[PDB]
């Protein structure tokens, strides 16, 4: 990697090559207690991710799709151009915190807390989860949606009061019998350190993910491959290409 910004090369240093991960969840849903681990590895390079969750309880409460939002947007692919919004890596090796609330259409809400840091070479993502106000007949608690993920847009803008980022987004999750069970999500990021961070300008993350399972696994488990890149800035001086 070679940039003229060395904030810019010191994010890019610790994204180089391939990074292990490590997730935690804590979840509570309507008093349902549940705990997710998950191991795999990441290469922002691609902006490609490829992750194993168990549940380490049991059965899952919910539906795994519920929880592939909230289960490290540090391995986004920035172009080369956009390199300079990139509030994630900026953040590291402290971290950041990362926190939403999940509003599922006519049923109940996720509020999430995580912590995104290194430890040692580790990218690690610990979560806590509350859930509220969940219908027990409904969608969530009634596993009706499909194991299957749609492709998304999140629209990323700064907050310098908090020296920060926000987004608001629309996940559509399938439902078994052909419509859509909406889930409005609502994220903030601020940095664990005090050291100065990149704050963007507008822009959004493109999203793609498959979800599948592992044929020799007898625990309930989820198994994702998630591409991330971020666009909407454009290059040149109208143009490079023109």
Not at 117 to 123: A, I, P, Q, V
Not at 201 to 214: E, G, I, R, V
């Amino acid at each position: 990697h070679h940039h003229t910004d060395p904030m810019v090369s010191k994010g890019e240093e610790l994204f180089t090559g391939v990074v292990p991960i490590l997730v935690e969840l804590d979840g509570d849903v309507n008093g349902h207690k549940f705990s997710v681990s998950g191991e795999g590895e990441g290469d922002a390079t691609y902006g490609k991710l490829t992750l194993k969750f168990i549940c380490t309880t049991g059965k899952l409460p919910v539906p795994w799709p519920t929880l592939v939002t909230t289960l490290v947007l540090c391995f986004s692919r920035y172009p080369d151009h956009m390199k300079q919004h990139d509030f994630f890596k900026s953040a590291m090796p402290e971290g950041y915190v990362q926190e939403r609330t999940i509003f599922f259409k006519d049923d109940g809400n996720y509020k999430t807390r995580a912590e995104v840091k290194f430890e040692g070479d580790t990218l690690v993502n610990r979560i806590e989860l509350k859930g509220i106000d969940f219908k027990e007949d409904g969608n969530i608690l009634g596993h009706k949606l499909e194991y299957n993920y749609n492709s998304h847009n999140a629209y990323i803008m700064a907050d310098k009061q908090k020296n920060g980022i926000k987004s608001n987004f629309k996940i559509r999750h399938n439902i078994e019998d052909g419509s859509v069970q909406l889930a409005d999500h609502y994220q903030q990021n601020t940095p664990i350190g005090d050291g100065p961070v990149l704050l963007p300008d507008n822009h959004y993350l493109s999203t793609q993910s498959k979800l599948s399972k592992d044929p020799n696994e007898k625990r309930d488990h989820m198994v994702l491959l998630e591409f991330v890149t971020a666009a909407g800035i454009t290059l040149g001086m109208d143009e490079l290409y023109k």
